[PDB]
Symmetry: D3
Subunit: 85 residues, 6 copies
């Protein structure tokens, strides 16, 4: 089966994440945008990372994102189907 | 278990939402972006948060209260399953 | 209900809109611009919350409308929605 | 001479602005993006940013088209005119 | 009489500090912000904030001082000032 | 100094980036995505504040990288302060 992985990371770790995913060979699967979050309130500029991966690739992915970036969270959510167009 | 709550809202309701989420103590879990929608071209705000299943009803009602006007298109809230969350 | 997401070529934004206008499905769609990688790429991300019964036709529509000619247009994913609330 | 016309408008005015510029015959000159602004912890606003580059001659008529379409009031927005040294069209 | 546009590209992590410094100065209302991509050298990819404020010519130096102070670590980004011919309120 | 903004076809984003990488100007460049109209268009917008002596080169680099057979605005800058 497939899974959507999303990570909301500190903006300044964009490069390290990019580099980490280049190296693991999974950059092409990654979409990135920039979003607004909050602390304390306080205004935070975050980067949101989206990747749809194989169930089997999930654990490794979380590890590779976590190491690259270590503010942040990663959530995994189910996918019914993918159609590569 | 864990749920993702997403809303598409009137752009003009951003501060009311933000203030309600501050008051409710959930703000740090919320991220926002601005997206294009369609009536007709629309500039909307997309809201995202991940919450305990037990806090879902309180989040829904908090967003709706902060952002409704009497509907000529106030928006939509969707809840979706989350398998896992990792704090880095 | 389901969520339909697609990451498509930026150049295909109009052929998507028009295709979705005609099907009566445009109102459901939200669009954002995001970055992918192939190399740095500018893509469009589409998001639709749809009746389950409409999902095959929506996928078929998005595919014919965007079909790169050739290699790596992008991807359409479907994921579950527990509920949707229409805001007052 | 050429000018850049920028406007920060109410997000709910994007369609009405767009419609007026279709009518005007200028739409193709318009670029839009969505930006954050602030009101009076400050108030967080979600706004629409408008960029059009026009001939000096068309500037007054444009400020007017923009204002008409977008006013309510209490937003409504602001329009800035700035100079442009040159425009190069790529083909 | 004269108006200027003050634009700055800053490190993303300095968003709060700039916000707070502008609130204090009573200048925040004039500011729009958006998130952009920029580049560095090992090219590296950088998340940035683009700041945009239209100000009275006489407030320009203060504004530069304010942004500069709020966002420096050293180095950080840049600020640039350009002319505005007119401003109209809708 | 002058500000150069360029609104370009989205699918030319990489060609332009690597062109500026080569030229040694990449660090001055900011990119975003905007919407235009032709009809709804996803555009890429590029911003760079450049020395006046570099403007001709920049225009040439951008046009040559992006053209297929968009637009670039050059506008004045009163000053730049590096933070």
């Amino acid at each position: 089966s497939m899974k959507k992985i999303e990570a909301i990371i500190r903006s300044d770790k964009l490069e390290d994440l990019k580099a980490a995913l280049v190296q693991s060979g999974f950059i092409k699967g990654m979409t990135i945008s920039q979003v607004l979050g909050f602390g304390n309130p306080t205004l935070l500029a975050k980067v949101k990372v989206e990747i749809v991966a194989h169930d089997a690739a999930v654990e490794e992915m979380i590890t590779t994102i976590s190491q690259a970036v270590k503010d942040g969270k990663i959530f995994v959510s189910p996918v019914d189907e993918i159609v590569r167009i």
